[PDB]
Amino acid sequence: MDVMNRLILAMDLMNRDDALRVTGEVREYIDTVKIGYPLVLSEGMDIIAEFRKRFGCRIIAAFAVADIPETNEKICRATFKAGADAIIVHGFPGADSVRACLNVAEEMGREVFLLTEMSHPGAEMFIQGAADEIARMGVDLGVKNYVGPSTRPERLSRLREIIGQDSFLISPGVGAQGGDPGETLRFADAIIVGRSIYLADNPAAAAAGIIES
Amino acid sequence: MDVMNRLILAMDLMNRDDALRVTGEVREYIDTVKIGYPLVLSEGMDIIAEFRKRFGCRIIAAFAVADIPETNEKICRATFKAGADAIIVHGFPGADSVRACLNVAEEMGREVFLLTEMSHPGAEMFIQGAADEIARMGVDLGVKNYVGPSTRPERLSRLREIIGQDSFLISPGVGAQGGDPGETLRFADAIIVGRSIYLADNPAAAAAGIIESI
Numbered sequence: 118m119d120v121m122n123r124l125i126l127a128m129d130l131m132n133r134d135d136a137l138r139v140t141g142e143v144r145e146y147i148d149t150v151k152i153g154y155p156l157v158l159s160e161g162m163d164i165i166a167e168f169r170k171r172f173g174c175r176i177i178a179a180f181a182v183a184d185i186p187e188t189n190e191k192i193c194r195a196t197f198k199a200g201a202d203a204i205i206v207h208g209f210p211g212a213d214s215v216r217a218c219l220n221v222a223e224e225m226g227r228e229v230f231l232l233t234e235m236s237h238p239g240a241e242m243f244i245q246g247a248a249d250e251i252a253r254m255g256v257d258l259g260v261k262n263y264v265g266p267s268t269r270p271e272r273l274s275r276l277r278e279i280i281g282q283d284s285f286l287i288s289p290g291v292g293a294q295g296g297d298p299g300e301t302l303r304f305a306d307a308i309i310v311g312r313s314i315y316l317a318d319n320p321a322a323a324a325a326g327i328i329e330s
Numbered sequence: 331m332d333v334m335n336r337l338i339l340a341m342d343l344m345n346r347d348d349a350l351r352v353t354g355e356v357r358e359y360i361d362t363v364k365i366g367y368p369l370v371l372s373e374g375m376d377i378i379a380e381f382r383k384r385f386g387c388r389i390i391a392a393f394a395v396a397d398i399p400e401t402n403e404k405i406c407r408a409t410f411k412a413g414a415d416a417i418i419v420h421g422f423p424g425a426d427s428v429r430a431c432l433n434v435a436e437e438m439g440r441e442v443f444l445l446t447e448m449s450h451p452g453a454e455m456f457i458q459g460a461a462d463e464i465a466r467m468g469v470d471l472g473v474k475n476y477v478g479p480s481t482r483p484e485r486l487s488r489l490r491e492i493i494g495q496d497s498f499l500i501s502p503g504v505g506a507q508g509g510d511p512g513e514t515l516r517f518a519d520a521i522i523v524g525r526s527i528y529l530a531d532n533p534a535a536a537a538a539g540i541i542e543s544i
């Protein structure tokens with residue numbers, strides 16, 4: 118995936134009008150948009166088609182997939198049918214759940230991102246201790262795309278080590294959760310940014326600002 | 331929560347027509363339906379309102395919520411606005427992510443179910459070794475409703491031990507994944523059943539048969 122400006126917009130606004138406006142305003146800067154459940158549960162899967170029609174930006178469905186293999190397969194099918202380029206899947210439910218998603222993505226020609234360690238404080242309780250093994254599981258399964266935390270650069274460094282230079286790594290937690298764009302991009306290929314852009318008075322200026330830095 | 335016949339239907343059919351037809355066939359037996367992302371992503375969140383209108387069943391949103399606190403809060407907000415009575419939330423992302431869901435549920439008069447240990451084989455890799463501690467975290471947070479695996483009755487037993495007899499416990503993995511209805515109801519208050527009913531030739535007979543076995 119060639120992410121324009123190394124910057125992925127996390128569009129977690131929950132009404133259609135505002136989400137469309139803000140994404141439109143930053144389209145000169147960003148060609149890849151991460152759409153998750155706050156927007157999808159508010160406006161429907163039809164929102165993915167709408168973004169493709171309006172903007173011709175790649176769409177990553179941030180659905181943190183975390184069910185049994187049979188249900189993960191259905192979720193991936195529904196999400197790729199709607200037009201997502203990629204889906205984010207949790208590794209902590211284990212290898213069979215991840216494989217189920219890889220099998221659908223292989224079949225429909227789309228991508229899986231493996232979420233390895235999360236960026237919020239609570240991630241320290243259980244996920245962090247499992248994360249290096251989760252990332253190594255991903256590599257053994259042939260996963261090529263990963264997600265790891267902007268808020269813990271030492272952990273993001275370790276996860277880049279495990280997955281190698283050829284793997285693709287994107288990282289949330291920049292801005293509102295306290296991660297730095299520059300320090301993150303020493304390990305991640307691209308940064309994910311939501312609130313620092315979408316809650317700005319001038320989203321385009323906020324995006325331009327991050328990019329210029 | 332009083333689940334009729336201790337049986338919750340997991341409605342994971344992916345089209346509106348089949349989902350409404352199958353649910354209508356078993357409505358005599360079941361007043362609680364677990365609706366997950368397979369149905370919601372195929373048909374929209376309006377399907378929740380439509381089930382309440384047609385059936386008046388309780389709806390548990392099986393969304394395995396597993397994001398950062400701020401995002402979990404927005405998912406719970408959207409879900410309860412859509413008319414879900416309860417939502418399923420993962421414990422593995424930690425206490426702050428579960429507390430975000432509890433906060434919204436409290437504000438809206440809804441219930442959070444904490445998914446401790448999952449029922450599929452992959453659960454053994456990472457989740458199982460954290461599951462007792464996740465359950466203890468639930469107790470510490472004041473969680474009253476939990477989910478644990480029919481496929482590992484000794485783990486389900488341990489979950490019931492940790493949370494005590496006054497917490498409510500529901501359990502998937504019955505039928506298709508190899509769990510036994512009667513054995514699971516030694517420890518769980520209610521069982522979740524999907525494919526054994528909704529893939530049956532006569533779903534009504536499948537549900538009646540299950541209820542008879544218990």
Ligand SMILES: N#Cc1cc(=O)[nH]c(=O)n1[C@@H]1O[C@H](COP(=O)(O)O)[C@@H](O)[C@H]1O
Nearest residue numbers: 127179235236289290293310311312401
């Ligand atoms: N993907 C993902 C996910 C995993 C993680 O560990 N940390 C996150 O912040 N996220 C998501 O990234 C986005 C971060 O947005 P923000 O820049 O903090 O506003 C949100 O959509 C959040 O749900």
Ligand SMILES: N#Cc1cc(=O)[nH]c(=O)n1[C@@H]1O[C@H](COP(=O)(O)O)[C@@H](O)[C@H]1O
Nearest residue numbers: 188340392448449502503506523524525
């Ligand atoms: N809730 C939940 C979930 C957590 C888990 O550990 N195991 C499950 O099977 N489930 C869900 O319960 C249902 C079990 O359905 P079935 O009876 O195996 O067809 C599915 O909706 C599955 O996604």
